[model samples]
Target: VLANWHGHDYQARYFWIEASRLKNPQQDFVVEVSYEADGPKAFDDVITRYNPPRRSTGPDRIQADYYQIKFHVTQAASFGFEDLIDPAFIGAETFSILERLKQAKGTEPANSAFHLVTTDRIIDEDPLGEIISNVDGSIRLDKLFDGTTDRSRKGKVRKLWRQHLKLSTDQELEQVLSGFHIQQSQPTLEAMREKVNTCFQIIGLITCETSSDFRFDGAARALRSQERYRFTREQFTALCEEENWIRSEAPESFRNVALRSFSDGPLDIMDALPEHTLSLLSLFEGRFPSPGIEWNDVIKPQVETFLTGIRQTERKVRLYLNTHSSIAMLAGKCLGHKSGVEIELVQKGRMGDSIWSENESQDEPDAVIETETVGTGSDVAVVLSITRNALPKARAYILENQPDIGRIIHVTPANGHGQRSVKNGSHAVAIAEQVSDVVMDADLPVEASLHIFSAAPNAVNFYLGQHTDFLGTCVFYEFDFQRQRDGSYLPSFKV
Candidate 1:
């Protein structure tokens, strides 16, 4: 395209002669105004060298003094030659090409080349390794993007650049320096994991004595399990030390409390015991801010002395987590031990007891099913709320309709709990049990259906559903924010 324009020695002008709709012969064409001394002959060379091979009126024809060149749309180049005038004014397809080119450049300097290589030196040939290790930015363009670094380099750079930066054009090298701005400003989960791994490397905690002691597949398994529990470095190290010390010093004593307290050991255990209990510190970091909680007081001399007794091959123990003085203490006293140990880890089966608190001292309902309208109808609406949002909306619906709602149970986080207030499964289980009873009390017919209006978080709703097994015919709902603005409830998905 450039050769045709410059071949006429600065005396040639290429123009689209007519728009497709205005063309009389129904074909797009280019008109070249050549003022060179060898006009027709020069134009004939261009047509003969680059024109479509055809023999109709011919690829080149003399139009008075200029050259009428026949060409297809594929051979065209578009650009924005004039700002004020539209393409219709000149019938040039150049505007489209220029628009696309501008987009491809995307704020970069137009004069700057794509690969911008400084020197042909192969410092490092691992572009992908550089990316994963966060070292891609420092490497030179010769090695990273351009093919100058290695003469034997295949087309891998372009493929890797496209896969990583998700660029659509061939100018992948242009965006490689800034990582195409894909890195997020704040830390994400994957980023956090990388930082933790880096910390492990720096602290030399990657493969420690604990991993060696555990041995075989045990090391990787324990590490993965600890990661699944979302343990920080400090927590992970503490748990590792605790387990290794137990296994190394007193194997029998380790079995006494270790396997009995938690069959899978500290990683699977949770901090469900009282504030002063000798529970594993790493286990409780999931739901609570582990750093803010008193760690030394909970796991220090009180626990240290008790575990020390096992090392000395004695049954003596100290401190307690349970509120009551019971048979476990009596047995320890009979055995001449200083104390009995009871650690309440938040096990999956123990969730019901945690949330409900054995239905102890009670307050008003966070939510309940109010008797909306008197009827023996089979349909009922159950509203579950963990916060202040859903119950009022549910009540409003009941009040507005004044229909035969079998029962309106407005369930709330018992005793005005916050988002994470339900710490365990008991409260959740209790709410679920209560809702189930309410629906059963309605005694709807065989064709009866139940509607659950959920204003709680996904976890809370899931727990509620787990406990409420008697929701026979039901359709769950999620409030659509946009629709709620216009006063309507949208059915989400049924269980």
Candidate 2:
């Protein structure tokens, strides 16, 4: 829509403000202008095009010049007002239009030349390998919007631009670099797993609390696990092993899950430990900058160590996922090892042996499985915490709400197993009892050892029975950021 005076090109012309009721705080209007131009001049200044102009002239054009221009609401920017403004004003209108057009055209190859090349070259590429490795790697883009005062390392785009400095013009470079934007990880499990693993490794360090040297073991273990878990080879083998095994004399039944639980082994054994104690780290990271607690001041060096840990984990996961290989390889080739590589390589080395013979292919262990039993059964404790007085009320709520579980098992702290008697009762019991014998007994803190122990499949059936459908029903403790306005401490939840 053009904001123009009748027959005056020099008039201060602007497009109509199109708004919907749902689009609150804004109003909508349409631009319906009178046709004062006889030829192509009318539409020329209102829009820009790459192709030669279209026109109808002479007596063949007839007395009335009829030119039809249409705008797809989904296709134009600021109702196409962007084509008429200056670069400074261009930001609000022009860039918005260009971006909208570029994105809309992105989905359809024929509509936009820029978008066509962009989708083919960038979007269709293996994004994890081509762009950021972790979610925070994606989050690092926040610097672009937030801006940085430190001129030495600023302008994220500028730094990114430096990578392609060899290109002659910004336009050429931009054409190639236009779509460098963060997208949510693709929905495929492989994609999500790769990203989740990488993110945990990268930001996983943010939660590392190792101060004493003993922490190194946890760090080392985390690094080692991050190196191996959730692999493509593992995925492929799991898919075809059974079918392939039946055809040959291979360890068909044991093909996918033979690595662990086999004490007597001709086959290679899995270490049977978690890929990383990341869940432990997650608990910590999720608890950082505590309410009134200055984590950085207390653990400054550890914080730095955590940062280094993340960088290391990121590098390792990148290496594991085979992201960004060196040019030396020329083509994609495995130049190094990840977690299960050593064990797999050993099996590969002795592939000619009977264990790994043509008749009996050796199998690797599956990560997600285990054994279980009764009172001796393993259980994972979920740390249940509440600052207010809801224990008794919560228990009554549960017992009244869920009566099918029969009687609740309220155990006394009998010593050992980190259980010191709470004088009156188990502290766990006290906490839960306060909430409600049912609510407290029903709830578990994620940090509880029982929760971790119960991660195995059998542990669920043997020890905890089956908890009801109460996953999203937890009482939400409200968070007030009163101190945020002042120079005060961070707010925290009761642990």
Candidate 3:
């Protein structure tokens, strides 16, 4: 039986302003849209209504055709709490309502003629809120309100605009948001690039400006810190230099890659790192041990040696990662101790800890090994099949069909019981060690291609990628489960 995976409970409140373009060129009439949902029934029952022209004595009067949507929902259990208020859901739900409004009026007007300002309040045991979107269809989550600020009037408004654009400086932000008509005046491309480059420094200064009244704690506080996204000036300079070089000599497509890597936060930067940097990262990966080991005793001296060597190289590098958790504790501390290094990522993974843990290991005897070679072409290839979920049929088909490919070596574990499958790092290491020996023993050409397929844990695959390096590029193949009905595990995507 499948276990229930529903997470947490939540009630969400949403507020939006609808403004319709009037004949008067200088003005637009506005009305409020609101929603509150604590349960599914109430959420689904909420509706959007069109308010036709009407005159009133008070300041509140609607004299044009317009529609508003809001929620009055109370106490509700939102399934998959993490996804309920996600940006994807916000966009879909908001647009779906607008479409319904259009259907109700029997005509659709250009979206530009309609202005929308939205804010969402999410209350669990504690409250989480954000000014979700604006007229230009931009989603903003940075300026957030929570339990700590529920009492303050200024706090609510401040949360609506804090870090809303991720811009670098107050002047830059002012230039963009001038007159609240962001649709008109905008920064140029060069200005935008400079802003992104210096965005972190600008945010640090702004965070200081707002922290006095922005009372928040726990995850909220951590999320608001500029340190998570800011890069040092030295790092920014290096990236700009690399950006110019790639634009001059590399393929045109590489320019996009460089821009994205620089703009998408620190992880993307890893792809553009020099081979020597990767080699050093791999070295660190090797030196770090698994659970049950006293890391300080076993790894402290090793890290000092590594640091001394790194310093001697006189390299100015920045590390981006969270330093609080055990997973990042070593890398953060090791790199933070050195000058010219900064941490980019603070939490292990943005979507939570996807990394495999040593605690999941299963005990079994050593794996059995068997090897065979086929073909006589120049491009040598190796395939490993050691898990119960191994693809024997796939291996057979490869050897039978690909004759032109140079020598091919196939390795598999002998017997099932009393032996560990290639599902753990230790077993994967044994497999990699043996494969390395075979490649050297055969004296294969240096350009041999390495392909891997197994039912091993993802951590096992990642570990093998770092623990072993083939003379040529390494490619991993995925076993197509749907195509396996014909009894062959077809591989897809060369990368």
For TM-score, the strongest prediction is 1
RMSD of each: 30.1, 27.2, 22.2
Residue 404 CA displacement from its true place in model 3, Å: 3.4
Candidate 3 residues 36-70, lDDT tens each?
Answer: 22222212211222233233212443333221222
Task: Arrange candidates, best lDDT first.
Answer: 1, 3, 2
lDDT of 3: 0.32
CA shift at 210, candidate 2, in angstroms? Answer: 26
Each model's total of backbone clashes: 21, 21, 25
Candidate 2 residue 185 Cα shift, in angstroms, is 15
lDDT of 2: 0.22
Candidate 2: lDDT of 461?
A: 12
| lDDT against the true structure, each candidate | 0.33, 0.22, 0.32
- For candidate 1, lDDT tens digit of each residue in 1-495? 112222121111111111101111111121221121222221221211101211121133222111222221222232211211232322244432122223334643332211111111222443333322121112233344554432334235555444334467545444433212111011222222333232222223332232323131243344333433223223434654655522222211111232112111111111112232333322432122121123234423333454445435433222212211111211122222122332121111111111111223434343344556535555778776564446677667655653556566665555553555454434554566677777788777757667677654333454454443465666554454464584445443332
- Please identify model 1 stretches exceeding 4 Å from their true place: 1-170, 174-369, 374-377, 396-406, 420-423, 486-488
